[PDB]
Design a protein around this ligand. Structure first.
Ligand SMILES: Nc1ncnc2c1ncn2[C@@H]1O[C@H](COP(=O)(O)OP(=O)(O)OP(=O)(O)O)[C@@H](O)[C@H]1O
Ligand SMILES: Nc1ncnc2c1ncn2[C@@H]1O[C@H](COP(=O)(O)OP(=O)(O)OP(=O)(O)O)[C@@H](O)[C@H]1O
Ligand SMILES: CCCCC[C@H](O)/C=C/[C@@H]1[C@@H](C/C=C/CCCC(=O)O)[C@H]2CO[C@@H]1C2
Ligand SMILES: [Mg+2]
Ligand SMILES: [Mg+2]
Length: 1217
């Protein structure tokens, strides 16, 4: 994609003529990610990232070099001052040509001031000054566009480089660093807190050309009107401190808001992710009050951070109206009198200094004080504890091997007991090491140790070769399943077929519509747990490495699938490769070449299974211990308040214009004078009333617009949140977590503190354009004749540019999400990415994502600054007409009227494109109001509570009956359950088993009405559909497959509704034996449980859930594969404690482990979604042809026999006491 910019001369690069071809493309057909141009090789993400990383690395070096001052990313000005000063030339020429052109305004009004007789030489001089004024407003809207384009691209370079290096760090930060922060925080850096660099640079020059021009203004205004000018500049002085405690105090409010914003976003992430869990526990009205409190404490710091940009845009808008007022109050109270060349050169000078001192200077201060917090937090991030850069690979003897000697390491060094102590093992090619132990032993810690992800406190690890790592939790990332398996490796048909056949994925692909090409959704919500594990194992296998760190890929699959994987995949493909296997399945230890047993970081014994038999040690014992705009504004205040707002806007603009006209009328009344004097009391009285009516109306308008438009983003959010809290879970299945959290972070942020500001800005500058055009028309009515085509051209320019910039903005907004998505995905699988030496490849992929979004942003900037240059050409045509349609029609105009008209036409420039380029941006951040309204009308779930509530003690018995119940995930979707009729009596324990995909969890889903069932489900003769969702769900406890601990106190992970006392909480913890585990923490009830569940043991949080159940005392407990990733220790304690506690409660257990279910009072066997056998496990073992007995036998002969007598004993003891 050749960029025309590198093939564009200066003439066509100033006016962006080179972009005209692209526009010709977009006018007809849609623009897509291919039409864009590749960014210039000077500004790919890689070059920018490398440059700024070199500078910041030299900076962290310098900080730790003879200085010992802390490092400073904001002192990487050193990398942009050379190229972001050459942009100061444009500012210096522009803001010294906005002081020059007022002189020529005075000299063109002087023509009318003296007279306009039949004097050709004076009229020719006026023509010359008008031509000079025109070419000074053309060479001033080219230095306003070259500067304001190149500054936006010099801020884009900083944004892109900073994003690139945030990735380059987030790809190299150690375990502790990933513990201190989260993926939410890093993506917040990359998305919401690096964007500040697109705006820090824009106004950064007017920090010096703000005050400087002010001085110049006085240095040119004294010479006109004497000491009086000081007074005006005096009230200019007061603005700079006052309007900088509006840009630092505002930024203080903004950073004090951002903590509430991210607390709300994180809590919404909890809600969106564990929404299934929240529905099942009926916690909805408990996070309805934890976002309604991190919002109403947020919308108290937005009605103060926006009523402080109201006082900052109403101190800009009415800045020169105060400055001119004070100036001429002093100027006439000092004895002088008003002539409309002093006054209007003063007006157009004080306007040009209003723009810079009162807007660009406080905007620069605010952008710098809002980007300094961004830089501060990005240097907080960039100084995190990065992983130890892999020690130089010593000259190897070519022998690929793993060698671990006296290994000792801490996951957290502050912990007293090390994670591992004194591990020592050597693995040579062809050797299968199987790692066994209890829950929390450190087997995955061991594989991390071989990975180098666990820094040794003592001991040595020497690992040589390509390492393929399967994590204990399978990593499933966005992309096709074939691309998931490839992981960037080249696709080869035969070996891929062999691996898939080995990984038992052939049938799974066959039952899919698209087979292996199916696009797997985010986080693997389209797949099952066993499917995710198989995908992960296949991904590792395909890379055909040397050393394979397998972290128990068999605990997520049934017995037959796990045996298939161990035999065909592990024992055949990995028969010649170095392999370390973590396993809780003892059944494979007989086939392991070598075994290492680990307990509490103790290598208990290392050897072959035969040597372990010879010692007589039992392994079980070892393991047992327009409508959008109406819906937007009306969501704010009543339409009467909007009428008041329109009246207030159009009174502020009429007074801002009537003040200038009053100076003009005063000047005309002074011209036609004489003794005779002018009633100065009256004139200053009216001229002060107009200034006060401008100031107060500007303030009132800028506060009312913000109050209304923040009052709609407090209503749109409160009206969209309450709908996603009631969206049937099908909604969360279809739309990922990211696509729902985005419209609660990005879109609500836009509605909160970027749409009110953009919209008030657009309203205010549109009204000033209306004021300018109205002044010109009322002064030179003939202008209405050339203003008809001059508008039509604009009508054909807004169209012809919105046929493309509706697409380029679309490309940018849709290719911005691949960057963050790839960050999140590459950050979940970070350990796997560093396992392979694939840091550079992921760098290339992320720089390609950033390059694509840089192409999109480059076209956005250049199309906007093509639009703006043509708009300013139209606006200079307007200025030409006013400045020359006053000379050809000189004999008709006063000298105060030409001054008024021309000093308004001159201010049209630069302001026109900003009321036309914000409309095209108001209606683009208003398509983030289709999105926010999109979920305020979603199909809500069934009513939460019907009026006919169940009895308070219901269900007192606990009988669950199915009558011809069919479950489909979506209406008309494939049936997962088919014609179910069953009966579970009071307190009866029934397991539910089948192959992966048998309909197991789907019965749960139909029980909770996750998708509404056809059929009849009876609970103590109560139909499920006849009772509200919360009356039901609060009456069935559940332990899902992956229990979730939500951030905050353990109190709110147990009782965020506070329906109990601390006594019951401690009773529950002592009933889950977690009283001692948490009491050791300083926050016994209030430990800062952080998130993601990487700071707890896998097998313990499932206990908290039953403690939750213990609080709620439900007769119906529903367990869904709880002890799947747990050793026999908790794999017995949970069930025995349940039998002691849920003996009186109907238990509904789903699991693959037949040991955990062998004593179930009944079993529901599901095959492909139908209830095949419903009879006690002993009878199902009686039928030799039963699938249940086959599942038992597939585990091995002795183990199947053991299950046989176990079920036999349970049956006989139950039935024949
Ligand atoms: N970031 C971390 N990642 C993993 N384990 C951690 C981490 N921080 C602390 N730990 C400790 O690791 C243990 C939990 O994981 P561990 O390595 O013991 O699992 P495992 O032995 O592989 O098997 P399982 O987790 O299934 O019991 C606990 O002792 C916990 O305190
Ligand atoms: N998020 C989802 N949306 C729609 N369908 C799904 C989703 N996840 C899984 N499925 C499909 O629904 C079918 C029924 O799943 P079911 O509820 O039986 O899971 P399960 O048998 O409990 O899983 P496992 O056996 O691994 O515990 C499966 O074949 C699966 O492919
Ligand atoms: C908090 C600041 C929000 C508004 C400031 C605005 O980002 C100004 C920036 C410059 C504009 C100058 C326009 C002049 C009048 C602006 C009117 C206004 O800002 O309310 C255009 C030329 O470069 C850019 C676009
Ligand atoms: Mg493990
Ligand atoms: Mg399941």
């Amino acid at each position: 994609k050749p960029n025309p910019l590198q093939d564009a001369n200066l003439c066509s690069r100033v006016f962006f003529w080179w972009l005209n071809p692209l526009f010709k493309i977009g006018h007809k057909r849609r623009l897509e990610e291919d039409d864009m141009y590749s960014v210039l090789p000077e500004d790919r993400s890689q070059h920018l990232g490398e440059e700024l990383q070199g500078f910041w690395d030299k900076e962290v070096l310098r900080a730790e070099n003879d200085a010992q001052k802390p490092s400073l990313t904001r002192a990487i000005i050193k990398c942009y001052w050379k190229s972001y000063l050459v942009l100061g030339i444009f500012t210096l020429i522009e803001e010294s040509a906005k002081v020059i052109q007022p002189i020529f305004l005075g000299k063109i009004i002087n023509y009318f001031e003296n007279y306009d007789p039949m004097d050709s030489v004076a009229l020719n001089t006026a023509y010359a000054y008008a031509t000079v004024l025109t070419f000074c407003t053309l060479i001033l809207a080219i230095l306003h566009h070259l500067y304001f384009y190149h500054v936006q691209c010099a801020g884009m370079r900083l944004r892109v480089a900073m994003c690139h290096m945030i990735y380059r760090k987030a790809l190299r930060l150690s375990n502790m660093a990933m513990g201190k922060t989260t993926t939410g925080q890093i993506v917040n850096l990359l998305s919401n807190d690096v964007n500040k660099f697109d705006q820090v640079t824009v106004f950064l020059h007017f920090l010096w050309a703000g005050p400087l021009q002010a001085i110049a203004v006085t240095a040119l205004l004294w010479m006109e009107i004497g000491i009086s000018c000081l007074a005006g500049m005096a009230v200019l002085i007061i603005l700079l401190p006052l309007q900088s405690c509006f840009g630092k105090l505002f930024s203080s409010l903004r950073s004090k808001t951002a903590t509430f914003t991210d607390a709300r976003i994180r809590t919404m992430n909890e809600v969106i992710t564990g929404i299934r869990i929240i529905k099942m526990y009926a916690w909805e009205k408990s996070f309805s009050n934890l976002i309604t409190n991190l919002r109403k404490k947020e919308i108290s710091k937005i009605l103060r951070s926006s009523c402080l940009r109201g006082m900052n845009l109403a101190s800009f808008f009415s800045a020169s109206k105060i400055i001119v007022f004070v100036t001429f109050t002093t100027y006439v109270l000092l004895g002088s009198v008003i002539t409309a060349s002093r006054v209007f050169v003063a007006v157009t000078l004080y306007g040009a200094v209003r723009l810079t001192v009162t807007l660009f200077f406080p905007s620069a201060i605010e952008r710098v004080s809002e980007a300094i917090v961004s830089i501060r937090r990005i240097q907080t991030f960039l100084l995190l504890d990065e992983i130890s850069q892999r020690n130089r690979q010593l000259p190897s003897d070519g022998k690929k091997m793993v060698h671990v000697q006296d290994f000792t390491a801490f996951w957290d060094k502050a912990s007293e007991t090390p994670t591992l102590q004194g591990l020592s093992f050597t693995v040579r090619p062809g050797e299968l090491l199987a790692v066994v132990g209890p829950v929390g032993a450190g087997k995955s810690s061991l594989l991390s140790a071989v990975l180098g992800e666990l820094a040794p406190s003592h001991g040595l690890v020497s690992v040589h070769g390509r390492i393929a790592y399967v994590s204990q939790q399978p990593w499933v990332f966005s992309g096709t399943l074939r691309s998931n398996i490839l992981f960037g490796k080249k696709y080869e048909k035969e070996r891929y077929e062999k691996v898939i056949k080995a990984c038992a994925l052939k049938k799974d692909l066959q039952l899919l519509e698209d087979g292996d090409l199916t696009v797997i959704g985010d986080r693997g919500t389209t797949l099952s747990g066993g499917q995710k594990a198989r995908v992960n194992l296949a991904r590792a296998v395909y890379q055909d490495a040397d050393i394979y760190l397998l972290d128990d890929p068999l605990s997520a699959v049934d017995a037959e699938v796990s045996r298939h994987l161990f035999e065909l995949c592990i024992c055949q493909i990995l028969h010649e490769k170095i392999t370390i296997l973590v396993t809780h399945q003892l059944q494979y230890l007989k086939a392991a070449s070598q075994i290492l047993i680990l307990k509490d970081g103790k290598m208990v014994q290392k050897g072959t299974y035969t040597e372990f038999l010879k010692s007589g040690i039992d392994f079980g014992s070892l393991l047992k211990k327009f409508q959008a705009y109406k819906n937007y504004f009306r969501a704010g205040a009543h339409w009467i308040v909007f009428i008041f707002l329109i009246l207030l806007n159009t009174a502020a603009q009429v007074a801002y214009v009537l003040q200038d006209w009053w100076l003009s009328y005063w000047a005309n009344k002074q011209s036609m004078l004489n003794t005779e004097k002018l009633d100065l009391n009256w004139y200053l009285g009216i001229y002060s009333g107009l200034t006060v009516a401008t100031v107060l109306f500007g303030i009132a308008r800028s506060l009312l617009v913000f109050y209304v438009l923040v009052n709609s983003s407090q209503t749109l959010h409160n009206k969209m949140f309450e709908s996603i809290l009631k969206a049937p879970v099908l909604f969360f299945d279809r739309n990922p977590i990211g696509r729902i959290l985005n419209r609660f972070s990005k879109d609500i942020g836009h509605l909160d503190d970027l749409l009110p500001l953009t919209f008030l800005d657009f309203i205010q500058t549109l009204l000033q354009v209306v004021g300018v055009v109205s002044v010109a028309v009322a002064v030179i009515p003939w202008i209405a004749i050339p203003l008809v085509p001059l508008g039509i051209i604009f009508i054909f320019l807004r169209r012809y540019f919105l046929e493309t910039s509706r697409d380029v903005k679309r490309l940018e907004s849709t290719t911005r999400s691949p960057v963050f998505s790839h960050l999140s995905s590459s950050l979940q699988g970070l350990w796997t990415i560093r396992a392979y030496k694939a840091e550079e490849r992921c760098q290339e992929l992320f720089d390609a994502h950033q390059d694509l979004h840089s192409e999109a942003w480059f076209l956005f900037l250049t199309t906007s600054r093509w639009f703006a240059v043509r708009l300013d050409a139209i606006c200079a045509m307007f200025v030409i007409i006013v400045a020359f349609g006053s000379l050809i029609l000189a004999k008709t105009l006063d000298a105060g009227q030409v001054g008024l008209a021309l000093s308004y036409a001159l201010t049209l420039m630069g302001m026109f494109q900003w009321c036309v380029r914000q409309s095209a941006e108001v209606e683009n951040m208003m398509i983030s109001v289709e999105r926010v309204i999109e979920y305020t009308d979603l199909e809500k779930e069934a009513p939460w509570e019907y009026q006919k509530r169940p009895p308070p003690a219901w269900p007192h018995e606990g009988v669950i009956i199915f009558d011809n119940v069919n479950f489909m995930y979506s209406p008309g979707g494939p049936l997962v359950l088919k014609h179910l009729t069953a009966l579970i009596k009071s307190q009866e324990k029934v397991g539910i088993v089948g192959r992966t995909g048998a309909g197991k969890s789907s019965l749960i889903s139909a029980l909770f009405r996750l998708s509404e069932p056809e059929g009849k489900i009876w609970i103590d003769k109560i139909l499920t559909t006849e009772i509200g969702l919360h009356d039901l769900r609060k009456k069935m406890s559940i332990i899902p497959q992956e229990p979730v601990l939500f951030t905050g106190t353990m109190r709110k992970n147990l009782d965020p509704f506070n329906e109990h006392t601390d006594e019951e909480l401690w009773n529950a913890l002592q009933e889950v034996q977690l009283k001692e585990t948490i009491e050791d923490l300083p926050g016994k009830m209030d430990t800062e449980l952080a998130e993601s569940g990487s700071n707890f043991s896998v097998g313990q949080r499932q206990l908290v859930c039953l403690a939750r159940a213990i609080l709620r005392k439900n007769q119906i407990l529903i367990i869904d594969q709880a002890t799947a990733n747990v050793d026999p220790r908790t794999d017995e304690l949970i069930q025995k404690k349940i039998r002691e506690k849920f003996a009186h409660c109907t238990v509904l257990t789903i699991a693959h482990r037949l040991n955990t279910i062998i004593d179930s009072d009944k079993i529901m066997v599901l095959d492909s979604g139908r209830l095949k056998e419903y009879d006690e496990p002993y009878v199902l073992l009686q039928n030799k042809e039963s699938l249940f007995y086959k599942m038992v036998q597939q585990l091995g002969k002795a183990e199947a026999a053991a299950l046989t007598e176990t079920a036999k004993q349970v049956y006989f003891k139950r039935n024949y006491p």
